[PDB]
């Protein structure tokens, strides 16, 4: 299956490429930096972002969105995580969220896919914790700040075994299950 991908993140392309490596499907990724909308439900956000991507391409194209949901911050980001990270980085994140009463937070990836006829929504989630100190490499955003539940290593520090339990892996497992199950 030849599916296209529109995104802004370049490392997202390499993650989706090594996750889907050897499956049979291929991804023709392109960089456009589609702006998102400020809504609470991620279904409408992934719907209109996939609408803008299909208006850009016109071929079968899927669209990914990733969000952090901080339980201390009453579930504030998720949909709006990009501006949060791009204004704070890892310096002004862990000193005021990792040292609070509730370090618990959940990270969700939602995939919106268009088969040129319909819109299909697939999602996955992992629970986790904010580290009090940023730890590991700092080349893939909040990977050095996010320890998963039941682990003591940040997602940048585990390395290539991040893509076996992460929320991108479950979301693209459901996407892979749909893509080889047929066009149902």
């Amino acid at each position: 299956m030849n599916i296209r991908f529109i995104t802004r993140n370049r490392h997202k392309i390499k993650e989706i490429n090594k996750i889907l490596s050897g499956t049979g499907v291929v991804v023709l990724a392109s960089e456009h930096s589609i702006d998102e909308i400020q809504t609470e439900n991620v279904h409408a956000l992934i719907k209109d972002k996939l609408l803008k991507a299909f208006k850009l391409v016109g071929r079968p194209v899927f669209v990914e969105h990733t969000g952090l949901y901080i339980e201390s911050l009453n579930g504030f980001p998720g949909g709006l995580t990009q501006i949060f990270w791009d204004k704070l980085q890892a310096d002004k994140f862990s000193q005021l969220l990792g040292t609070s009463e509730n370090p618990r937070l959940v990270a969700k990836t939602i995939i919106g896919y268009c088969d040129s006829m319909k819109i299909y929504i697939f999602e996955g989630e992992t629970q986790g914790t904010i580290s009090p100190v940023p730890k590991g490499p700092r080349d893939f955003q909040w990977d050095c700040i996010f320890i998963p539940d039941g682990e003591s290593e940040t997602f940048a520090e585990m390395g290539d075994r991040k893509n076996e339990i992460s929320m991108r892996k479950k979301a693209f497992d459901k996407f892979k299950e749909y893509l080889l199950e047929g066009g149902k």
């Binding site: 609408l51 299909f54 208006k55 268009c114 040129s116 006829m117 319909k118 819109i119």
Partner: protein
């Protein structure tokens, strides 16, 4: 505007009603119509739109389903439902109580006649040559310029039909092009996104000028609700005069524009 009011008493104004008048009643709309086709075809409402006009997104249904019957059935049963009350629509009331000798329309329903009967009037539907042979100069004439649901060989609901009907060779055309000579037309309910009105008038006008009596060609009109700068100059080149309002409630607007005629 005043000029119009002048003639509404001489009997030289013809009314051409369009879909906007309906809607208010509570009927569906191409929105729902074009969506229905989508679901019935496996597509998603939005995605389907990104492919053609609207007429086109109906030349297609048919082609797949072979014919237009399946659809005409849904429209007829849905629109002419029994949850619609006519006595609750002023627009349809004022129209019935005015005094327009001839009434053309591009809607497919049957609500205008229903109203005229409800408030006590008489009329003759005309949708084929046979009817033309029954016209009584003492009753109103309601002409269906785009077909009714009582026949499928004459229903303009697709491209290839909004075509052979751009040559004005059908019997019902020859009639219009003889009625407009000597009278003026008040368009209402219409949305200017159709070039039938721009090839009829563009073609009537150029006729008077050859006759060297342009100053006689009767004046037309077209109540739109919100005004447009650009599309007011173009529509004068031909010869139609726009009218408009300030009340922003569309329905409210149309209703009053009409009381200016009902009186008496």
């Amino acid at each position: 505007m005043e000029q119009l009011l002048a003639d509404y008493k001489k009997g030289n104004v013809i009314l051409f009603v369009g879909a906007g008048v309906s809607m208010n009643l509570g009927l569906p709309s191409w929105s729902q119509l074009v969506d229905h086709i989508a679901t019935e075809l496996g597509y998603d409402p939005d995605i389907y739109r990104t492919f053609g006009s609207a007429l086109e997104l109906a030349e297609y249904y048919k082609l797949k389903k072979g014919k237009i019957g399946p659809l005409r059935s849904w429209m007829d049963r849905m629109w002419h439902s029994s949850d619609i009350d006519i006595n609750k629509s002023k627009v349809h009331e004022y129209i019935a109580k005015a005094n327009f000798p001839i009434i053309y329309t591009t809607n497919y329903d049957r609500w205008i006649e229903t109203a005229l009967s409800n408030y006590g009037k008489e009329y003759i539907k005309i949708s084929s040559v046979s009817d033309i042979a029954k016209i009584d100069n003492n009753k109103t004439q309601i002409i269906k310029f785009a077909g009714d649901f009582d026949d499928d060989s004459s229903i303009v609901l697709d491209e290839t039909s909004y075509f052979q009907r751009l040559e004005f060779e059908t019997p019902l055309d020859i009639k219009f092009r003889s009625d407009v000579l000597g009278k003026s037309v008040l368009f209402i309910g219409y949305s200017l996104s159709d070039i039938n009105i721009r090839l009829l008038f563009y073609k009537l006008s150029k006729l008077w000028k050859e006759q060297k009596l342009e100053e006689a060609q009767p004046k037309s009109y077209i109540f739109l609700p919100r005004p447009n700068p650009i599309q007011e100059e173009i529509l004068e080149q031909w010869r139609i005069g726009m009218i408009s309002s300030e009340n922003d409630n569309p329905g409210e607007s149309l209703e009053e524009f009409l009381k200016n005629f009902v009186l008496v």
